[PDB]
Ligand binder design. Structure first.
Ligand SMILES: *[C@@H](c1ccc2[nH]ncc2c1)[C@@H](C#N)C(N)=O
Ligand code: NA
Length: 302
């Protein structure tokens, strides 16, 4: 059993920071030393125990497009995770509110986000919650470089029976089959969530939900063998190639579903320059989509 080096020190969190309003619970804080603002996720050690989460942030937070860990504190009761504060709002939210947005931009956004997940998968890490509310802009520059994946609270590292850290490529140590099994699903679910992101970006509405009032039963009935709709209406002006990527990302059978690696090799991603640069015809109800998203993931987690 190796030592876990965490918390238990002199300087408290309150000493170096001051807590502003809300944004486990998230709140905007300020570093009173430099007067710089950050975000602090307060976790209840009597509930979660975010040892798995903090490990990922420390190790992978270096990634440009992954929310960066700026500090961490432990008072013995609660765990304080200080990260960079997202000033650009929700990615999908902002995009849907742009009257002028095209596939060329949609492919560049998904590329940056998928390239990020391909890295996490290769290190044996699965987010397991990819919903759009966790993908945010650090700033308003509008560039995909300002994109950040956030809230790894449900994230998981691949480990062997020994407790060792494992990567998908190196199999030489024993890992419980059902662990490798779930690891498969969890990785496929991440791509599925990204499939829901692309579908909404293109059309302007969610595939399995209309609005927040949709019953979980019907939402799950759709998500089930039930097939989504890639044609007519908002799909008429959408490129045929783009429709192909969406169907394979949302494929009902996980084993037939596309992998982050393959997604990046898709002509839609590979040849972006072929894609249309003109504004997409979409529904504008960003707030309604918000309700649909929450409702969709509420049925999943219940
Ligand atoms: C709250 C949260 C934590 C840190 C942040 N930095 N900028 C915005 C936020 C928001 C949670 C959500 N949503 C989360 N853990 O991401
Ligand atoms: Na980062």
């Amino acid at each position: 059993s190796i030592v876990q080096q965490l918390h238990r020190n002199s300087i408290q969190f309150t000493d170096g920071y001051e807590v502003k309003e809300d944004i486990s619970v998230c709140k905007r804080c300020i570093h009173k030393a430099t007067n710089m603002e950050f975000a602090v996720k307060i976790i209840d050690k009597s509930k979660r125990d975010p040892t798995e989460e903090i490990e990922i942030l420390l190790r992978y937070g270096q990634h440009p497009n992954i929310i960066t860990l700026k500090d961490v504190y432990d008072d013995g009761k609660y765990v304080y995770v200080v990260t960079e504060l997202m000033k650009g709002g929700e990615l999908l939210d902002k995009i849907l509110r742009q009257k002028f947005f095209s596939e060329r931009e949609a492919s560049a956004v998904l590329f940056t986000i998928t390239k990020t997940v391909e890295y996490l998968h290769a290190q044996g890490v699965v987010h397991r919650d990819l919903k759009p509310s966790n993908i945010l802009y650090v700033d308003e520059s509008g560039n995909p470089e300002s994109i950040r994946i956030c809230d790894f609270g449900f994230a998981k590292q691949l480990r062997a029976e020994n407790g060792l850290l494992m990567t998908p490529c190196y199999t030489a140590n024993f890992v419980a089959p059902e662990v490798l099994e779930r690891q498969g699903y969890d990785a496929a679910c991440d791509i599925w969530s990204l499939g829901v992101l692309l579908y909404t970006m293109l059309t302007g509405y969610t595939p399995f939900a209309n609005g927040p009032d949709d019953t979980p039963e019907e939402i799950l009935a759709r998500i089930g063998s039930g097939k989504f709709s890639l044609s007519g209406g908002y799909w008429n002006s959408v490129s045929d190639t783009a429709k192909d990527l969406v169907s394979k990302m949302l494929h009902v059978d996980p084993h037939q579903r596309l992998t982050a690696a393959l997604v990046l090799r898709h002509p839609w991603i590979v040849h972006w320059d072929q894609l249309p640069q003109y504004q997409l015809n979409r529904q504008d109800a960003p707030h309604l989509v918000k309700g649909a998203m929450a409702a969709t993931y509420s049925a999943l987690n219940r």
